[PDB]
C-alpha cells in the first residue's frame, strides 16, 4: 500500500477533499491544470528545468488528494511547491527570487512590496509555512519518476522519427498538466499512452517485434492494447473540454 499510496481509483478521485467542501468535479479538474500552468509559467521565468516543473506539478496533484482547494488556494500553494521542487531537483532558487516571480504572475499590475514592509516579510513566512505543510502532506516522499523517462527510452528503441519522438515527449508534458493520470497510472504506462497517441496522429503502426512482443511490451508488461485505446480516448476527451474547445 506504500507503493499504492499515491494511486487512486476513479471513485477516490471523485470523493476528493475538494469535493467534501462543495467543489465540483470539473471545477476541481480546472484548478489542477490552472495550478499546473502557473507552475509552468514561474518555472520558465526562473528558468528551472522541465524536470523541476514536472515534479512541482506531481507535488500539486498529490497535495490535493489530501487537502482541499477550499482551504489552500492553488495560487498560494503553487509557488511553495515550485520552491521546494527546485531544491529537490538540484536547481534551487532563492526564496526571494521566487516571491518575486510569483508576484509578477499573480499581480503584473501592482509592484513588489518593500523588502522591508510588514506585508513582504509576512508573506515570506506564508510561503515557508506552506512548504512545511506540503512536506508533511506528501509525507516527505520527494522522489518523483516521470513519464518522460520511459518515453524517450522507448522512442529511441523503435527508432521513431524526430517528429514522433518530440511529439510523444510533448504529450507526456501535457498528461501532467491536463489529466490526473499521474495519480492513476505508473509513469511507464502513461509514457505508453503518449506514444500510442502521437502514433495515431502520425498514422504509424509500430512493427511487431519478429515473432513476438508489441512495442509497449518493451516499456511495460501490464499494458494491453485495450488499455492504450481507452486511455487515449480518455485523454482526447479531456482535450476536448478545454476552454478553446467549447507576426
Amino acid at each position: 500500500n506504500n507503493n499504492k499510496r499515491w494511486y487512486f481509483t476513479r471513485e477516490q478521485l471523485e470523493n476528493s477533499p475538494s469535493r467534501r467542501f462543495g467543489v465540483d468535479p470539473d471545477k476541481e479538474l480546472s484548478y489542477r491544470q490552472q495550478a499546473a500552468n502557473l507552475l509552468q509559467d514561474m518555472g520558465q521565468r526562473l528558468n528551472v528545468s522541465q524536470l523541476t516543473i514536472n515534479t512541482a506539478i506531481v507535488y500539486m496533484h498529490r497535495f490535493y488528494m489530501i487537502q482541499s482547494f477550499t482551504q489552500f488556494p492553488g495560487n498560494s500553494v503553487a509557488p511553495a511547491a515550485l520552491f521546494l521542487a527546485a531544491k529537490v531537483e538540484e536547481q534551487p532558487k532563492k526564496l526571494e527570487h521566487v516571491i518575486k516571480v510569483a508576484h509578477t504572475c499573480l499581480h503584473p499590475q501592482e509592484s513588489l512590496p518593500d523588502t522591508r514592509s510588514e506585508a513582504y516579510l509576512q508573506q515570506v513566512q506564508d510561503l515557508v509555512i506552506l512548504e512545511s505543510i506540503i512536506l508533511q502532506t506528501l509525507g516527505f516522499e520527494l522522489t518523483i519518476d516521470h513519464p518522460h523517462t520511459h518515453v524517450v527510452k522507448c522512442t529511441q528503441l523503435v527508432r521513431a522519427s524526430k517528429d514522433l519522438a518530440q511529439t510523444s515527449y510533448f504529450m507526456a508534458t501535457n498528461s501532467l498538466h491536463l489529466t490526473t493520470f499521474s495519480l492513476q497510472y505508473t509513469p511507464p504506462v502513461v509514457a505508453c499512452v503518449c506514444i500510442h497517441l502521437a502514433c495515431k496522429w502520425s498514422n504509424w503502426e509500430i512493427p511487431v517485434s519478429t515473432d513476438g512482443k508489441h512495442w509497449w511490451e518493451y516499456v511495460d508488461a501490464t499494458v494491453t492494447l485495450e488499455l492504450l485505446d481507452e486511455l487515449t480516448h480518455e485523454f482526447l476527451q479531456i482535450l476536448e473540454k478545454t476552454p478553446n474547445r467549447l507576426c
Binding site: R5, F83, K87, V88, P92, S132, T137, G139
Partner: protein, 325 residues
C-alpha cells in the same frame, strides 16, 4: 490540518539525550507500543531563510533511497504539532566511542570484520551514486549485535557517473578536516568515491592507533601532515597535480618521502593490514584503491579470518569497578 502521513512524535517516549549537542538535538527513545528502540534526530533550523534546509532535504531523499545492512536506517519522519524529527533504528555505540575507550579491546580478526562492513557499506552507497562526504569514526555506529552502520548523511549528495563529457562542480569545502583527502584541500571540485575511501583509510589506522593520525589545525597544516606522512605532493607520484590553482599559491614541503607503513609499523604489525592502509592513503585519487578491490585484498582473506564483534563488545563494561577491578 490533515496529516495522514506524518505522525506526531508522541508515539515515541523520550528516554535520554544522545551526546552533548544542543538542547533537543538527538534523543534516545522508544515506541510506546512495540518498545522499539529508535533515535530521534531533530531537523535543525536556527538558520531560517531558504525555508526547510536543502541539506535536510538531501539527507531525507538519500536515506529514503539507501537500504542496506550497513547503512543506518531511517524508519519514518515525524513532527510535533513546530519540529521535524528523523527517526532511525537505535544503535548502541559509535566507532569513535569505542576507540577512545582504551579499555575496550580489538582483536585482529575483529578489526578485519569492522573494515569489511564499513567498506561493504561504502560499496553500496557509491553503487547508488552517492558520496558520503563526512566519513570519520564518529559517523560509524555499531549495533549491540555487532553490525556496522554508516550514519550521518547530512552532507551526502548524489554524483554523476560521467566518464564521458563535462566537468562536475560539487561543493569543495566538505569532509571534516582531519579526514579530508588531498584533492579537496588543493581545491578539487569534480571529485568522487575516492574522497570516502581516503576517510576509510584514516579510520582504519585509528583502529590501531586509537586516535586521528592527522590532526591539522588549518587546511595548510593538514596538507602538511599528509605530506609528512604519505610523501610530498608531486607530479611524479600524482600526475598533473600541477594544474590545481592552489598547487603553487600554497606552502608545500617538497622533499618528504612516504613513511606510511613505517610510522604505523609500531601499532598495526600485520603485513596485510599495512598494505591496505597503504593503498587507501594514496595521494592521487585515480590511484587510491576502491571498495571493490579493498574488499578483495588479502587482508580479508588470510588468517585470521574476520570474526563477529561479540568479544570486543563484552570488553565494553557497565562502569568503573568492572573496568578497574
Amino acid at each position: 490540518v490533515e496529516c495522514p502521513f506524518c505522525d506526531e512524535v508522541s508515539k515515541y517516549e523520550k528516554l535520554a539525550k544522545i551526546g552533548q549537542g544542543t538542547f533537543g538535538e538527538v534523543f534516545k527513545a522508544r515506541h510506546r507500543k512495540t518498545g522499539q528502540k529508535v533515535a530521534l534526530k531533530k531537523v535543525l533550523m536556527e538558520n531560517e531563510k531558504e525555508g526547510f534546509p536543502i541539506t535536510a532535504l538531501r539527507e531525507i531523499k538519500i536515506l529514503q533511497l539507501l537500504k542496506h545492512e550497513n547503512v543506518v536506517n531511517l524508519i519514518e519522519i515525524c513532527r510535533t504539532k513546530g519540529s521535524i524529527y528523523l527517526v532511525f533504528d537505535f544503535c548502541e555505540h559509535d566507532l569513535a566511542g569505542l576507540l577512545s575507550n582504551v579499555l575496550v579491546k580489538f582483536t585482529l580478526s575483529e578489526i578485519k570484520r569492522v573494515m569489511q562492513m564499513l567498506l561493504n557499506g561504502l560499496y553500496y552507497i557509491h553503487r547508488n551514486k552517492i558520496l558520503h562526504r563526512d566519513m570519520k569514526a564518529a559517523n560509524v555506529l555499531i549495533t549491540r549485535d555487532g553490525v556496522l552502520k554508516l550514519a550521518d548523511f547530512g552532507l551526502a549528495r548524489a554524483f554523476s557517473l560521467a566518464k564521458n563529457s563535462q566537468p562536475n562542480r560539487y561543493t569543495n569545502r566538505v569532509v571534516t578536516l582531519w579526514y579530508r583527502p588531498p584533492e579537496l584541500l588543493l581545491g578539487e571540485r569534480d571529485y568522487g568515491p575516492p574522497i570516502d575511501l581516503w576517510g576509510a583509510g584514516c579510520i582504519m589506522a585509528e583502529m590501531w592507533t586509537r586516535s586521528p593520525i592527522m590532526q591539522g589545525n588549518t587546511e595548510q597544516h593538514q596538507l602538511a601532515l599528509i605530506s609528512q606522512l604519505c610523501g610530498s605532493i608531486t607530479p611524479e607520484v600524482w600526475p598533473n597535480v600541477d594544474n590545481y590553482e592552489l598547487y603553487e599559491k600554497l606552502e608545500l614541503v617538497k622533499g618528504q618521502k612516504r613513511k606510511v607503513k613505517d610510522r604505523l609499523k609500531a601499532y598495526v604489525r600485520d603485513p596485510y593490514a599495512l598494505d591496505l592502509i597503504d593503498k587507501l592513503l594514496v595521494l592521487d585519487p585515480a590511484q587510491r584503491i576502491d571498495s571493490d578491490d579493498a574488499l578483495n585484498h588479502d587482508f580479508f582473506w588470510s588468517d585470521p579470518m574476520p570474526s563477529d564483534l561479540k568479544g570486543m563488545l563484552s570488553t565494553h563494561l557497565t562502569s568503573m569497578f568492572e573496568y578497574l577491578a
